[PDB]
Input
Amino acid sequence: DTAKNSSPIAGNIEYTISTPGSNYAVGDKITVKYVSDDIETEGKITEVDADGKIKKINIPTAKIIAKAKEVGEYPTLGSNWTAEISSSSSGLAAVITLGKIITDSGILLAEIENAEAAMTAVDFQANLKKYGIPGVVALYPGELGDKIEIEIVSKADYAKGASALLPIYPGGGTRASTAKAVFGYGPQTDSQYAIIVRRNDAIVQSVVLSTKRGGKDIYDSNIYIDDFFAKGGSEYIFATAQNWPEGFSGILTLSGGLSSNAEVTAGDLMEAWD
Output
């Protein structure tokens, strides 16, 4: 069929800011209802302009997806579903129109020598910005990449240790940060992020990398994201600094991994056996 690498884009809900309105604020809550009953109440406005016009929002999808599957509307959704901004907000007049649950990861990597071109392609990048997440994906295409989860902690949030409750994307909820428990040494600049890669409850990689060209670890090793990955720094994931949200901390669930039927080996099955 079609090969795809698991990404943080799949699993999100399409949205359009049909009318931006005005006087809204970041943090204003958003409710998604099904046939006029609350399903998800922890959506939020994530970007506004100077006049309070809504620019970006974030809607967690775990409860929406669970319900959609129950009622036979996954992942199309449709006109049974509505989004609204909490009545407590100062804003007015905005209209948010919901679409489907995204199943396309939006990315396929082949040889890591051409991966940066894929990672920085305009369509993929537009979706990273729209959903407010960094571009971190499974290195190899296939369903197995869905089992990779990334935990990312900024310098400011690293200092907080387990007091930092990290939001989980795109599903919702939070989880206490493990970065201070896992690393001896944390981010050294505000361009640096502790990245923990887990597969099947096991940390398979953990490293502090930078979104700033030229930044290095204590051994003068290059830790700028795109370089680190282009040079084969990971056997599990690939990433870009482009549109990495400044100060991002959070947990990324990857999905949408898909194999080309002809390319699957018995080895891939063994590796999936858990």
Observations:
- Residues 62-71 form the longest helix (10 residues).
- Residues 143 and 236 are 13 Å apart (CA to CA).
- The radius of gyration is 19 Å.
